[PDB]
Amino acid sequence: KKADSASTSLLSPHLHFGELSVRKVFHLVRMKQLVWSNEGNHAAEESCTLFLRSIGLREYSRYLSFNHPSSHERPLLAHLRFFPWVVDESYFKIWRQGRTGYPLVDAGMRELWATGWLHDRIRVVVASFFVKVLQLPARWGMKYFWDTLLDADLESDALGWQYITGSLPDGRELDRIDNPQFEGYKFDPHGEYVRRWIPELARLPTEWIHHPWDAPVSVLQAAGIELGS
Amino acid sequence: RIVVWFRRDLRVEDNPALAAAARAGGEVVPAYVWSPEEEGPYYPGRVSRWWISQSLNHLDASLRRLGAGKLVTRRSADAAVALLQLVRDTGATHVYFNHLYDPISLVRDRRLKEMLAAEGIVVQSFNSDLLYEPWEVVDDEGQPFTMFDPFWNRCLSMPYDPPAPLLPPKRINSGDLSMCPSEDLIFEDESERGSNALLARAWTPGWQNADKALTAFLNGPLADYSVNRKKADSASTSLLSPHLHFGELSVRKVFHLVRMKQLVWSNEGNHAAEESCTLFLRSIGLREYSRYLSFNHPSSHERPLLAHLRFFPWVVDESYFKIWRQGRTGYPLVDAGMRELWATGWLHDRIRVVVASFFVKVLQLPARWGMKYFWDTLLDADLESDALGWQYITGSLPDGRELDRIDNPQFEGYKFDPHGEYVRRWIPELARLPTEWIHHPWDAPVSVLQAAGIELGSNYPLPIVELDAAKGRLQAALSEMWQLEAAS
Amino acid sequence: RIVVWFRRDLRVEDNPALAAAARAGGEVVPAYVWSPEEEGPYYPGRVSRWWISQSLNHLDASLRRLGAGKLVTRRSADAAVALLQLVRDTGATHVYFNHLYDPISLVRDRRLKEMLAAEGIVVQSFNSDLLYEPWEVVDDEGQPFTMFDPFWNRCLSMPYDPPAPLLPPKRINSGDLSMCPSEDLIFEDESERGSNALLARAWTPGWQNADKALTAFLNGPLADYSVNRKKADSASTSLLSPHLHFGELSVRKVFHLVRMKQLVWSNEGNHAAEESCTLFLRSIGLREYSRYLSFNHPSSHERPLLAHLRFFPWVVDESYFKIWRQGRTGYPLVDAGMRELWATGWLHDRIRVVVASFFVKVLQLPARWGMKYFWDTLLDADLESDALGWQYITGSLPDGRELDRIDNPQFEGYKFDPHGEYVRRWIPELARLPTEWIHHPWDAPVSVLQAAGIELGSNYPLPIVELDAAKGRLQAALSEMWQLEAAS
Ligand SMILES: Cc1cc2nc3c(=O)[nH]c(=O)nc-3n(C[C@H](O)[C@H](O)[C@H](O)COP(=O)(O)OP(=O)(O)OC[C@H]3O[C@@H](n4cnc5c(N)ncnc54)[C@H](O)[C@@H]3O)c2cc1C
Ligand SMILES: Cc1cc2nc3c(=O)[nH]c(=O)nc-3n(C[C@H](O)[C@H](O)[C@H](O)COP(=O)(O)OP(=O)(O)OC[C@H]3O[C@@H](n4cnc5c(N)ncnc54)[C@H](O)[C@@H]3O)c2cc1C
Ligand SMILES: Cc1cc2nc3c(=O)[nH]c(=O)nc-3n(C[C@H](O)[C@H](O)[C@H](O)COP(=O)(O)OP(=O)(O)OC[C@H]3O[C@@H](n4cnc5c(N)ncnc54)[C@H](O)[C@@H]3O)c2cc1C
């Protein structure tokens, strides 16, 4: 879940274009598990269980688009039909540029533009922020993702946006906003993800690095931060 | 329910019998039956008996982690009588195993199928030793091959790739084994247990260690196998020899992984490395051909193994045999390899011929004698592959080596040991002997021998038999036999 | 203007003669004269000569890269004669050298001072080999110490530290030495060149390689020296002794570098590594004590080296000496070391103790005989250090090892080779012989020796002298010595 180290496989663009077998990955990972199990490496053995689950989420993305496709009788985000979206091109511009003022969001929006890739949980953060705080049409953000992601994948993108907006019963609650400290402690506990992509805040302590607006002026002056300039 | 009879398939990955039993959804009782009496003249060797007992504890441990209660062991002179007795004690319904191809098991297994069928037992056997079954690769008129090259190039152009390796069972369940008993097997005599344990200096038996050894070769010396496979002065070959004999590592997995290594190197412009896997798979195929020859052309009485020298005048000299055993022959490369064989239960292929070519073409003792020594002191003591290897050096088949001919030791040395570092390592007595003479010290000037502190006869032995006196003896023994040949 | 005379300081860092010649302003003529006939019995032996031939070539290039024409190589039977031909030929004002401490050099080198000061040459000598000069360290009455512990305790408590290693010259100015000729030195018999060159398998002589071996030991096995220094089955020691014998490395740099490693380890809580440095410096101090002994209590005629063993009736037996050199004694730890001494020119200090103790305690051959062999086979053959070692193992020192006593080979084996892997590396014949008997095969039951494939007397020798015979003959030889000693 951490975005402050290279914790994941970085295989998603390779897998989107089919440059790698998922049946090889399955088979190779199942062999690593058998060996680790014989070595007493119980935490590594569960690592394989959980990583295959992530491979299975890609399986479920295809399983969803085949068995319950987008229709007209009920579309993608059908539960948010009468949702009155904020229409505000200015807000969409600030979001793309990572100038929202929420450091975990800005840090990810800067990395998405610079490398074409985002850790799955930073995807959750930037997209949740998009439809929960700015509350802009999810279509808008779905399209930007399509132009900036190297692994832009039809079924997987649909599943992700469906997950973060709560169209799935599996999905994330609708009537709810994440506290940015909840996001920060789970995906960036030492703030090193924010500091890598927003060097401006390097000297801002971990205690406020994910919600600078709450810091006292003295603490923001010590960090050399003037909120607004 | 199902009983998985392990024999020479001591592994969990790509074990079709075990995989098929686990997938049936019932219970899986793994077991090993120790019945060496059924192999007669091929009773397992001394150091092979040590490896097995190491491997079984290794396999038992890995089976229990998968959920098995234990590995069940039974001791009886007849496999079937023990296998039947087991499923009686367990109330089992099936007996799965992987079929072998040596002339002993082909007949013993076949009788077990019928014997167990009669008693009401569902029995099925699976392939786990070979890329392709022998009765799949035939010439274009549908008849078995008789030379290695046409066989292997047909295996390499076979219409379907060899089956990719199966996955190990995620879990196996066997139920209650507290009444199901296992009698401790005895693989070692008490007076040899200590001397046996030192084999662990060089080998750790077990499927896990087979896996690690394969990974090590693939990331290491495999790229340089094309230019160095003949060298013995370094770890140039895979050292997967005893693992593959006990089925601790799937040859089909070796094949698939190497073939895919070939593809990446080809795409990387690494032609030498690409060429290297070609030859390494050929070495795998020689093990295929080992079972081919034993399935199609087995040998008992009309052409038993080394029938062509039925009429050879063997030097029956137990003194010379002992001097060959102790590596006291005065031929370094022969003595070096003979030490390592006793030390680590293993020898490089080319050294396997040096000490063997020497045993039958220089000392000219019964080839059946040095065969029984290899059987007792090789960890990878393999019925079919030992058969092939001797047939090769004696010239018993058209692929083999030229008969009236003896390798000059400097030829051997230059191909297998350019800097003499192999025998300097195993014969530190010769460490100061310059490389030029290191493989033939008896032709060195006394001034050089003493400068190296060598004194032939006291420091390092004199050549027990001279080469001239041996090729001479070779003619006198071969035409005496061809004279005996055309006389019957 | 200034001659720099090299002898056993074949380095360019912390070399006070060369570093003061360069800082005088004028030119510097660096030279080495090969005057072995002056060394009497201590004429450099076979393999020590092979080291100098490489070390000098290696020091030549070093000097030439620093702005020199060459290292002038002179030949003579008298060093002064050749040295003052050179002061003339090359016309210099001064002659600089770093002074040695052996009994030969101590008085040969004061004959050079006067000989050269009579033809108007100014001479200066510097310290290049010791942390402290022998006269600099004394007891409370101003007297030399007689045991090692009080002496080394004093150096460790001296009022000043060992001088920091000097830098090498920025470059040296030699002038035109296109005039000055150098005598092609001969260090190797033609007959021995081919076996002498195999010493490079294990060693590379030279100022540059001494420096790489030190930082290899400092960043490697120095941290475990406290617990592993006695074992010969791993590379537990620095392997710096030949480098230090020829002065290719500063001991003042080693002292200073090791004292810095200790300060860091102490700040890291690494208490076992901190004691490792304490103990390794002690080993550097044993080299200091070797010079301190040869300077303060030299070999005299009133009392020689092994003076306590004057009336000792030695076994005179050239046959026994031949078996000892060849490592066929039948004692595996001894044979293993005698094989490695011949093959590499080096022995771990405790294997030196074993092979030399065996020489004067079991075979009881004249210690002179073994002292001479050591001189011809050791790359680090060092006058004072060899004297100290033989004096230690024979019990001429009060510090030394007990006289009326023989080590049980299992005591030696468990301390220096607990798993027998030293014996098995150098005697592969015994690879399959268990650790429990590998250091005393004669005690094993026949079954255990047959399991190990050992026939004592054919495969590996019998004990040339049995321990109980050796101890009985030792008490009979000492009583013979002690009844004789009182008769005077
Ligand atoms: C709003 C949103 C949009 C997304 N858009 C995409 C997209 O366009 N393309 C895409 O491939 N994934 C998408 N995902 C899923 C997930 O973010 C990525 O699969 C993951 O970040 C890729 O990094 P990785 O390769 O290191 O994954 P790892 O953790 O290393 O996982 C290994 C592989 O499993 C697959 N995988 C992992 N998680 C998921 C998941 N939730 N759904 C589907 N497959 C998964 C991928 O193929 C991935 O390469 C999206 C998720 C969200 C919440
Ligand atoms: C006289 C003689 C006796 C032999 N006895 C045996 C024996 O008992 N058991 C045995 O497995 N091999 C035997 N061989 C074959 C060969 O010597 C060994 O297979 C090989 O040296 C083992 O080293 P390796 O595993 O590193 O070989 P590699 O170079 O790594 O070869 C890969 C694998 O291919 C197989 N293989 C390679 N060469 C041969 C070959 N010539 N014949 C059969 N299989 C081969 C082995 O399974 C080997 O592990 C014998 C050869 C000779 C000449
Ligand atoms: C019978 C006998 C003969 C010996 N002959 C020699 C000889 O010819 N030359 C020689 O240099 N040493 C000699 N020694 C001392 C000792 O054996 C060697 O110094 C040591 O084995 C060298 O290995 P090393 O460099 O790894 O030592 P380390 O343990 O790494 O010690 C570092 C350095 O300390 C010095 N040193 C260590 N132990 C001693 C010691 N006991 N006496 C003097 N200096 C020591 C050496 O310069 C050595 O290189 C002899 C000892 C004995 C018992």
Automatic annotation (TrEMBL), chain A:
FAD binds at T8, S9, L10, L11, S12, F51, R123, D151, A152, D153. The record marks W85, A138, W161 as: Electron transfer via tryptophanyl radical. Belongs to the DNA photolyase class-1 family. This is Cryptochrome2. The chain holds residues 231 to 459 of 688 of the full protein.
Automatic annotation (TrEMBL), chains B, C:
The record marks W314, A367, W390 as: Electron transfer via tryptophanyl radical. GO terms for biological process: nucleobase-containing compound metabolic process; response to stress. Residues 1-131 form the Photolyase/cryptochrome alpha/beta domain. Its cofactor is FAD; (6R)-5,10-methylene-5,6,7,8-tetrahydrofolate. The keyword Flavoprotein applies. Binds 1 FAD per subunit. It comes from the Eukaryota. Keywords: Chromophore, FAD, Flavoprotein, Nucleotide-binding. One of its GO terms (molecular function) is blue light photoreceptor activity. FAD binds at Y225, T237, S238, L239, L240, S241, F280, R352, D380, A381, D382. Belongs to the DNA photolyase class-1 family. This is Cryptochrome2. It comes from Zea mays (Maize). The lineage of its organism: Eukaryota, Viridiplantae, Streptophyta, Embryophyta, Tracheophyta. The chain holds residues 2 to 489 of 688 of the full protein.
